[PDB]
Ligand binder design. Structure first.
Ligand SMILES: [Mg+2]
Length: 202
């Protein structure tokens, strides 16, 4: 069920069990939280989910940091979607926030970044990928309200422990599929392919 936002444990990053999981670890992006909440854990292995916060002192604890990913393919390219949960999106807003960036690769072996798509109010798209947004192969993402949205940045960011959709318990996947996050939507549940279509760079 729903538990207190600050009581959801950080899911430790496991060793990658296969090449899908190792690749998502390798391309884990950096996030520069300019304003608003830090990323928090949204789900635990029993399928309890975050109750969020009613619309930053309650969502600034760096020890709660977490990032999610799901991998797949679309239209001949390889996609790794990285997603963050924030307990609220309140520029002065609503309970819960789900944001995601898609790192597009030509294929999972060559693993050349061909484009980046960042969620915003649709998707901002950097295609061909602007190298000033990459630290090596590490995309530099911002989280900022001017609603809080993702964007690309040249500023260095921070990283979080990654738990992948492919590494979660079934209870956690079921909870992410079924839970009402209100104005926010999990972008890597059964809508994953639909979101990749919207993120696609043409
Ligand atoms: Mg937002």
């Amino acid at each position: 069920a729903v538990i207190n936002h600050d009581a959801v444990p950080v899911w430790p990053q496991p060793e990658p069990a296969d090449a899908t999981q190792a690749l998502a670890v390798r391309f884990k992006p950096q996030l520069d939280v300019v304003n608003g909440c830090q990323p928090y854990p949204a789900v635990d292995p029993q399928g309890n989910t975050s109750g969020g916060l009613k619309p930053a002192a309650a969502c600034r604890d760096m020890s709660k940091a977490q990032v999610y990913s799901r991998s797949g393919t679309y239209n001949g390219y390889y996609a790794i979607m990285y997603s963050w949960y924030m307990p609220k999106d309140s520029p002065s807003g609503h309970r819960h926030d789900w944001e995601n960036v898609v790192v597009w690769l030509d294929n999972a072996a060559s693993a050349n970044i061909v484009a980046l798509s960042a969620s915003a109010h649709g998707y901002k798209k950097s295609f061909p990928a602007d190298k000033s947004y990459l630290d090596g192969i590490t995309a530099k993402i911002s989280y900022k309200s001017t609603d809080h949205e993702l964007g690309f940045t040249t500023s260095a960011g921070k990283q979080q422990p990654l738990i992948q959709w492919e590494q979660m318990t079934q209870a956690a996947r079921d909870a992410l599929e079924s839970t009402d996050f209100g104005n926010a939507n999990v972008p890597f549940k059964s809508n994953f392919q639909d979101k990749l279509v919207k993120a696609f760079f043409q």
